[model samples]
Target: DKIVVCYYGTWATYRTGLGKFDVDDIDPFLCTHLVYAFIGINAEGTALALDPELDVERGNFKQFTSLKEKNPNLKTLVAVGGWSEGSAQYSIMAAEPEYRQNFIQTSLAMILEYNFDGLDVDWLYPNRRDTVHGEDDIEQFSTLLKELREEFDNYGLLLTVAVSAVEEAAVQSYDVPSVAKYVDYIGVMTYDMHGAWDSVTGHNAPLFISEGESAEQESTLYNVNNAVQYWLSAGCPPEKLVMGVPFYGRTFQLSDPSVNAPNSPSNGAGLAGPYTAESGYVGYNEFCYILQQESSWTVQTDNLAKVPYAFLDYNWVSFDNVESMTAKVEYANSFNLRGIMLWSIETDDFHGLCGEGTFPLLNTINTVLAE
Candidate 1:
């Protein structure tokens, strides 16, 4: 149940603007799950028939098969209903039994056809309305999970779900109790607690609930403890919980370096607004590549959480580098809880599956595990 590693096959088709990246690019052997995002569903719940544009359907299956060969024990699954278009479909699906059944059957067919081990339901929320939302929908979600789980249980397959990180999102979007009873595990998306999306600044994911610093809004540094606490408080078992880590870092522009002081000079939320590559926020690797000469920030360990942070002049960057992540591994180990789930493997550096380099995220995990 621990260390359920996953690499999302995001709209890589759309993002890289490539026909298909070599499966060998991801070191499939190192991960446990290779998740592909989205197989669309109609208003009636039938999986939208794939048009096969650019060989998308065949290409995706091929990648999954190739990776399965690379890691025989690895589980391959499709993530249904991500944050974008899928979320918009929540309301209708919750109330429409016919549509829900259609969606479940359609998904089941794809999973079997692709020989997937399980399905990762990323409803983003359960009770809000659109793709899958509502308090009453809790009963609906439980029903959905029960049906899916029963099907999988008969076949000895897995069923899992991705849940919100914060208590509000958890209360608003997740049916934790019902989910716990039906799925193999519930993945708490603990990272991205704070990011460029916020109007103010904050850590990407803090390890502890910062108290007293309320004036400074220390909750900005919402960490793992708080994340875990929320779920446990919601009655989820520790063994069935998988904490999430991140492969990328957020960026912010210090707008007024002079007087705005802390908040000025591009208040640091790690945001990269619409801008050309030359003028805007860049990827972690790109940011590191250019700022290599600048004095790297200090990574001090927090005895309480056993994690580290990069502290520098007035401005600070909070990320889970190898050292910090190693510390986190230890923390997870000490707690005797399920292992970590990363936001993605694509953003990580390492040859194959996610190439290698400075602050290589995967390498760190592999190195620690090997040791």
Candidate 2:
């Protein structure tokens, strides 16, 4: 598919032994791609072997099986090595030719077994290690993807990667240009630009300048212009990239309102609050739960960024709703982004129409994309 809207369908969701999807409230048209949760493998430096779960055939592509049934052109893939556990094994896998082949083989096995159309490699990052993963991990990653490209050419399987928005991290770990040449698309994760991580608060995913402040910091710190420019500057083609959109929100606590009281500076000073969750955020469900109880505040729409924010009690959160989502669609169309990829399928308003209430996220994207 030239344009792809993708989502991560969790393994835990399928492993619940439901044998089938309990959530029927899905609009197949909401996205063009449905990626099955997982299938981890042992990343031995010499070779890639199936993880323990693969032994019992425990990783079935069941979370969104009805996807194709609902829309024949809608496609799916199996995403391997997500944010946490699998990331730790990347350093070893990128070291040798034998290991790369093994990793390719394991990935191919899952694709063939599930009849998936492609493969998405989510290594979190390969080269520069995060605080959790290894340091000096980027070079080998480029080599592995380059090797995988040759194999993919021979086999004709689609390959892609889920990359980070941290500019420094992107420059250190990912060889965006080389990977772009082979992979079908690069999933550019542009969210989490700001959160409690910063001494202040910020929008979860603003369309334009964050906090509608200085144009300089806006595009650099937590915005789309910089992320896209950096990726292409690194060599990834625009057509080969897909921007990521979050179907969730970030929450923060506010104390001594006087501390940053009206400290909302021109660019990045929205957070005068305290800290809330650890991973630093919550999904749509939790966002709504707070709204229903009726005690949060959201920023009025920031037209420049084309997104919305809400603040409640001493806490404030940033997220996309119908109104703001409409701007996102406009921005996507304006930039001609390859397509929009939601963080996960489960996060969307699967039951109701897309534009109504919580379903706006799903509806707005679908409506605008179809246009």
Candidate 3:
């Protein structure tokens, strides 16, 4: 059976008005694997560490992997680094042998102490040619992974890495053939194909590139279809690939109320929700609220991309629902892919407020993938 992995953010509990989401709140039976996002590097650059203020009360790291008690078959991993966690710290250590050795040693130590089954490296796009670290990062990263895999193998632990979905970014960030050989699997972050960063509004995670779409047109090489193919052709095995699906939507404010089609001009981000509070983003729960409360917002599906979007006047939101998620899961199954992964478990409306019950989005994933 294909595995289902879900990332659980430890800090979701601290989102101002959203209330706390503890490890106890998780549905243990859902995922085959649970990856705890971010156990960062120590200040001394010698070990893995957690946020004292945030993780201390949450049992530091043990709280997550302990879920195996409820589901003995579940595997848990500790992912290091994230977009907000920054790459400079990891970049510096990864470039040097001594520092890299220390980091890996400490990582293994943390894994044993926390009862984790694996380690996930989330070095947000390493080895970009024009970046601060330069191209040396490409080879250094492979070396780090090779040594890491060696150590993890000794302990019978799994090794994985989260990679960028953007085709251009993937080529620049990774030596795919080499990196793929070291890690047990690769999680392609297929979301964020488009956002406020774009000049026009587009789907957050389009499954396919529509007709007449290109880099200069409505679509780009960043869609799930192209990104997965890119990696496959680059020598990564299909079974080692895990597709990422976001439980949140990227919101954009239309430049003109009358124009709501694809590639429509956009001024910038839309207003943040009461809970997430990010200017241009909304969690699935917030999107559900808007969809229900705002009657004028018409939901439309892009037949080519196989995803749904909604817009009312100048407010537009692109995200995945049950149908689109089912389509993605179907796509993954077609290729015999390793699995489907959710960016976060907490982002979905987990309280049945939207009437689908806890994990409506994830439940859809499970049902579709099972079929």
Candidate 4:
């Protein structure tokens, strides 16, 4: 059986009305593993709850882990150090063996106290190029994982890691063989390959690079297929690699709305979602709602890229729906990869806002794997 590793982004709990997702909103039976994201590290390298009032005072930790009672097979993991956590803290912490020990000890203590099944270290590219990190971060990261793995074995807790999708950054950020040997699951963030930041529009997670582009674009390993293949070639076992899929769309303001297609020039981020209220992206919950409420949106599929983009007036967005998600799962299955890891579960139609059943995107994984 394939795995479905869903991350429950804690910030979503604070969202208003239909966008807010509480502990009970999750279908305990939907995912094989559920991870609570964004636990942080302090100056002393000890665990720090980013939102203490919410996590401890309000009982989210207790409420979140209680899902195991409903589904005994479900695995729960607490993640530390997301993008906002920054690579600097982790780099400095890993530099010294003492700091690394404190980080692990404090992290393990909290995981045990909360009765989580495991812990995920999200260092966000340890030796990231042009980012805040040490030159020896690659080796330091390996040692940290090694030490953490030993501790996990003693306590019998799972250890997994979230890694970058870009090849250049990945090579500098990780020791492939060492990483493959130390972790239970290697989460390859296969999305965000392209977005509105570029001069031209691009899919958030294109399955393949469109051949219509020049040889230079097609030659580069800039798509989901090449990203995963690079990890496999670099020493990660196919069975241990987990591919990430997004439940959101990368948006752009089309400079020329009359010509709506891939590579269309965009001036800026598309209008923010009513719920997410953020620029550059929109949750599937919001994106699907727009498609339902606004009939003028013209969506066309790119057969070569195995993705779709919808445009209305000057607004344009490239995102994954059921068909693209299905194609991705089939691709994962062919490689015998561990399974699918939705970037965050809350972004999916948790409330079934769309006419489709709850988690239409999340459900697509198991559907394709079963087929």
Candidate 5:
């Protein structure tokens, strides 16, 4: 059976002007599973702890599980770790059996205490820069998953992992064969292929490689097509692979407005968003608002890639719109993939502000993937 997994970031509630987004805002009917990201590793490296100020004070953990009341079949899982957390703590814990066991025990305990149905491991990557990552961390990660799977299976709890979409990152960080053996599904993060780090502007999540680009440009390597194919070739089953699509877009400041083509030079990340407060990033809602308010921005689509982007003045924003999402859903069906996983439920235009009605993006997904 196909499943739609949606992530709910607890901290988005405090995202400046967005006000407070609580459990009640979630549309339980839209997704089979909802993951809360993320809980942090305790200082002692022995347990998982919700941030004292962020999650605990707000009762985010307990409230998230309560969404199951609206839809009993809704599976809730608490994800540990995220991009900002880096990999140092996880690297240390994954390297030692004692530390791994400590983390496993605490994680399971946390899940039970919060009435969660499963645990999601989001270690970013086992061997990436910005943390204490090493080659051994890859195998150690497999050990951690195997141990977690053994314990989770005993309780009939789900064990899932968020994996890299980039081919280089995937090969360097994951023991894909071992991962397939242990996890219920792998959430492939197919977004963020290009962002602030780049001097050139490109699609945030192109569905396929655009033509006319050389191998030196590596255009073929970064798109969703190759990313998923790489995993399948590495031994992951299609049914156990869930494609992750972003509910946000990557923004860039154009160095030359006249040269607004993909891979064109860029000054840097786009302006910081009011709610997200991040440079080069904007939610679907924000993007829609930008389009509605600014007539100068021209929307363009890559027929080959099956994605869209918009440009205005000196800013270019690449993101998936409703049409692009439809294409992606069809792609998932064509590949017999398990289903689609949205990076978040909150980023969607849930309040009908974009004239797309409440939950427009999610509704499109349901309509396309419905059995």
Candidate 6:
């Protein structure tokens, strides 16, 4: 059996209009495993809910897992850390056995209390800038996972990890064999390979190296096959790996209007979306709306890289579409991976604003994998 893991960014509730996606908007049967975006870490080294008001008082967290009622076999889990949570707190906690035990107990409490089937750990990076002594985190982090695994085993709960996609970061942050030994699935954070932070435009997630890419770029670049191969070569079993794909695109502003292809010079982030409201990013729904309203936008297809980009005036975006997603699904199937996991379900044309069918991206994964 294959598992299609889907993550729900709970904060989507605040987005206005069609961009707003709450727990209720989810298709219960869309994926085999459903993971809630994040919980937070307390200064006391305990796990805590990030938004008590929305998650508890308003009953969103409770309502989140209740989807299992509609799909009895669906597995719902809560992720414990995100980019905002930072690495220091986790580094501090894992440094001490007492703190590690405190984390395990409190996290288990939250998981069981919220009626979640399991917990997903998303420590940005174990050492991340060497939060503590660089190598100390390697052992401490693995120790924490090992301990969590032992305790979780008694309760028959699933354990998973959100790992770094950049091999440079992956090597520094994870003890691959030790990590593989503890978690049920390792969700590699494969997207964000490039973004506006770069001096040039690039795909958010390229399937392979693009033609004419400089050797320097290839050395620093992270792609689907390259990142996945790193994990396999590092001794992680293929079945335990869950590949992640982004539901959104990375936006950039071209320095030269005439040079808008990838690796072209970029000045800064492209304009923010009406909903996501964040520069350098746009949801599928938001971008699709642009294509619908403006006929001036031109799209470029790079079959060699298995990605596509669009540009208009000086703004450009590199994102995944039905075509690229199909390639990703086929790549996953060929690898015998556990399955594909979306960074989020909300951004995947969930409302089908352009009349492209709700969950067009998600349904594509389901349809292709089922075949």
Highest-lDDT candidate: 6
Task: Score candidate 2 by TM-score against the native.
Answer: 0.81
| Model 4 lDDT per residue over 268-357, tens place | 798788778888899998998989898998988989899988999999899889889999999999999998898889989877878888
Answer with 5 or 6, whichever has the higher lDDT.
Answer: 6
TM-score, ranked from best to worst: 6, 4, 5, 3, 2, 1
Model 4 Cα shift for residue 142 (angstroms): 0.8
Tens-place lDDT per residue, model 2, 15-132, is 2221112335456666677775455556563322234343234534543554677789777776776765446577777776677788877677657665677777878667544423
For TM-score, candidate 2 versus 6, the one ahead is: 6
The model with the greater lDDT, 3 or 4, is: 4
Would you give me the overall lDDT of model 4? 0.87
Estimated TM-score for each candidate = 0.81, 0.81, 0.94, 0.97, 0.95, 0.97
Q: What ranking emerges by lDDT with the best candidate at the front?
A: 6, 4, 5, 3, 2, 1
* Residue 117 in candidate 1, Cα distance off native in Å: 1.3
Instruction: Sum up the clashes in candidate 5.
Output: 0
- Per-residue accuracy of model 6 over 35-90 as CA lDDT, tens digit each: 99889887557989898899899999889999999999999999998999988888
lDDT (Cα, 0-100) at 270 in candidate 4: 86
RMSD of each: 4.6, 5.0, 2.2, 1.5, 1.8, 1.4
Cα deviation at 150, candidate 2, in Å, is 2.6
Report model 5's TM-score to 2 decimal places.
0.95
**Alpha-carbon shift of residue 91 in model 1 (angstroms):** 3.1
Q: Which candidate do you rate higher for lDDT, 2 or 4?
A: 4
Task: Tell me the lDDT of model 5 at 196.
Answer: 61
Cα lDDT tens digits for candidate 3, 172-288: 778899988999889999899888778888888999874336646433456898888887888889889998999989989999978887678898997677677788888887788
Which of the two, 1 or 4, has more TM-score? 4
For model 1, residues 1-371, the per-residue Cα lDDT tens digits are 45555756454444342223335566676677777665566677676534345225456655665577768878887777666644556556756778777787787887777677888887756676454445666567778788888777767778888877877667666667888988877888877765555544345555664322253554334677777777877878878887777765555544443322112234545433121132222344433432444565444444444343344444344455666667656655666657677767655543221234633776666566454
lDDT at 249 for candidate 5? 92
Pitting candidate 2 against candidate 5, the one with the higher lDDT is 5
| Better-scoring candidate (TM-score), 2 or 3 | 3
